[PDB]
Amino acid sequence: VGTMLTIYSKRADHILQRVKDRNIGEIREPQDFGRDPIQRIHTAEYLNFFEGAWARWQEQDGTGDLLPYTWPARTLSQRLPTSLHGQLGYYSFDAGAPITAGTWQAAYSAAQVALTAQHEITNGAHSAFALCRPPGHHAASDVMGGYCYLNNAAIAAQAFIDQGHKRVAILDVDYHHGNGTQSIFYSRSDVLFTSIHGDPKFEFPFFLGHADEHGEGTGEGFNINYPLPAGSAWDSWGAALDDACKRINAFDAEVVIVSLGVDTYKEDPISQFKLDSPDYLSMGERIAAMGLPTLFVMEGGYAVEAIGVNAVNVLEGFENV
Amino acid sequence: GTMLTIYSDKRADHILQRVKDRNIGEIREPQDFGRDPIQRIHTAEYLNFFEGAWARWQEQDGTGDLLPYTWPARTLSQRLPTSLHGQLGYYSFDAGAPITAGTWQAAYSAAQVALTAQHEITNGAHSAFALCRPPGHHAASDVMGGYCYLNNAAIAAQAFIDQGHKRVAILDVDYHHGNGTQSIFYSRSDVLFTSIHGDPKFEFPFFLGHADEHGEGTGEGFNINYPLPAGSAWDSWGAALDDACKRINAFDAEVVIVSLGVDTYKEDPISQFKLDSPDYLSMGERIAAMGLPTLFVMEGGYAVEAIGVNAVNVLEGFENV
Ligand SMILES: [Cl-]
Ligand SMILES: [K+]
Ligand SMILES: [K+]
Ligand SMILES: [K+]
Ligand SMILES: [K+]
Ligand SMILES: [K+]
Ligand SMILES: [K+]
Ligand SMILES: [Zn+2]
Ligand SMILES: [Zn+2]
């Protein structure tokens, strides 16, 4: 099948090269669907802060990245200050989301890539590939972090619901927890969130991703975390994947949005799992086994030499079935 | 001189030199009063973690200084990981309390310095000066940050209680809100906390120190924050101090513990207040006007030329009355 469409605006080199080489499908640049769909997920205050945060930082002759150095952690009140760094902490949970001169445009653009690829599936396609940089799954509704500024996968999922789908499901195969994606839908039952990550007991982001986070309110039952121990290989990982996909199918998801990080690779420096490039074909073949329209959204992965092979193996395997 | 100074082992140079020159009183090494009084404020889990942190970092060949890089901020669980770094971010609220080779012994030693000066007062001295480094008022019961690891002032406050007193009051004159001290006694009314500081809406620690934080439960009404705008001078600052001292006295404090920071100085690089060297004399007289036995605990104050002059002016003006 030469059917899946890739959307794109060193690392995207290897991915895009492998997309042509393995004949996944055509590549197209994004269209601009505006700020409204992003604001279906992110609060207006957060988007406004984000739009003007670097301009405000140049108003003080600030040199280098804009970065938070204080956070509203335990014993403190979760109350919004007015100074620029005070707010940056309010809207963040680590020092991993640095703001520079092009961060907003770059983040806005990634959400459009996701939304474009999203609209391909609405216009009849069975699958698409949103090659997003920066990634998004660590970003919550008004918290940024871990190189995530806007939650592309959550924005694409929300688009599917606003376009008439009763239920959809996010499957997050990134090595890290989708703490932002979890937080965004934590109390909803129209979006199921599954995630296979390194156990937050030892792994970033530490403070979400435990298996006993099932949702709150009406979203109880529709948050499913699969924390695995360091050293995990495909026998454990793929057994989590099997359980997760069965859950998605019993939830009667009408589309599945795949948060595709390939930093599970054994040669990835941030990884503590032991997946090999063959494992990614198998991950595509199992995801395809759900029989649903499937949107793949790029998340994490160090620009190793094999990032194109690892990521496009999922798409290859998907189209294999 | 009638006021003893306790000191351990670069600002201290200027301060001790000015304590000698102005004949403030003797200068004495601390004693070890043990872990128990530190533990009347801080959790044993926090004390064990902090004292073993450097050692675990060197057991995993840690490169340099030990610092957190993730925090249980908004949308995250305040739940403790097992990872060294996850634990560290759980026990902190910012990146400004690093842990290196000598750190827990240095923090332990400041608490001991504070306890020795507290002890001089219990034995019949009207005042004493704890020349603590590192400072303490940003540390809560089990949160660290702002170069504060153990809350010196709060440990000495509680010692006064454990040694007989019904009621004590803490006066935090540092330019910054003493968030950890407000936290430690927030639902208590035998310990009245007051603080004058740059409005947290723009000044660190950002997320505590608003005027509407009056206390919790039976601590309701026993926590008095005086946030001030940037550019404040003695007409405003002395007004807060005059109201705070009135209210300490209305409280029947038997001992007042002053968390003494001099980073309110106009020439201090961190300050957004405009206090002058003679202002610290007026400050000392006004505290002494309260009529109470008074323990002075060093906090902030960048190592400018005048730090010794300013700090010792509060003690001089105290002894003038
Ligand atoms: Cl990531
Ligand atoms: K982003
Ligand atoms: K994941
Ligand atoms: K949900
Ligand atoms: K204090
Ligand atoms: K203060
Ligand atoms: K109190
Ligand atoms: Zn990742
Ligand atoms: Zn200070």
Residue numbers in the entry:
A (entry chain A): -2 to 6, 31 to 342
B (entry chain B): -1 to 7, 31 to 342
Which passages does the manuscript contain on this structure?
Classical Zn2+-dependent deac(et)ylases play fundamental regulatory roles in life and are well characterized in eukaryotes regarding their structures, substrates and physiological roles. Structurally, these enzymes are composed of a central eight-stranded parallel β-sheet flanked by α-helices on each site, known as the α/β-arginase/deacetylase fold. All active site residues were conserved, as shown by the multiple sequence alignment and the structural alignment, suggesting a general acid/base catalytic mechanism for the bacterial enzymes as described for the eukaryotic counterparts. These enzymes mediate catalysis using a penta-coordinated catalytic Zn2+ ion coordinated by two aspartates and a histidine (KpHdaH (1b): Asp181, Asp269, His183).
To explain the molecular basis for classical deacylases to act as polyamine deacetylases, we structurally characterized the enzyme PsApaH. The crystal structure of PsApaH confirmed the analytical SEC experiments supporting cluster 4 enzymes forming head-to-head dimers. Dimer formation is mediated by a structural feature distinct to polyamine deacetylases, i.e. L2-loop (PSL: polyamine-specificity loop). An important specificity-determining interaction is a salt bridge between R95 of the L2-loop of one monomer and D163 of the other monomer of the dimer. The N-terminal L1-loop interacts in trans with the L2-loop, occluding the active site and thereby restricting the access of acetylated peptides. This L1-loop is highly flexible in the apo form, as it was not resolved in our apo structure of PsApaH. In our PsApaH structure, Y168 exists in two alternative conformations supporting the flexibility in the unliganded state. In PsApaH, this Glu106 is replaced by His106 explaining the higher acetylpolyamine substrate promiscuity for PsApaH. PsApaH and the P. aeruginosa enzymes PA1409 and PA0321 also contain the PIS-motif, which explains the higher level of promiscuity observed for bacterial polyamine deacetylases. Notably, the bacterial polyamine deacetylases also contain a conserved RPP-motif (PsApaH (4)/M. ramosa ApaH: 154-RPPGHH-159) and an XGGY-motif (PsApaH (4)/M. ramosa ApaH: 320-EGGY−323), identified for robust deacetylases such as KpHdaH (1b) but not present in deacylases with activity for longer acyl-chains, suggesting these enzymes prefer to remove acetyl-groups from polyamines but no longer acyl-chains. Only the cluster 4 enzyme ApaH from Pseudomonas sp., PsApaH, showed activity as polyamine deacetylase.
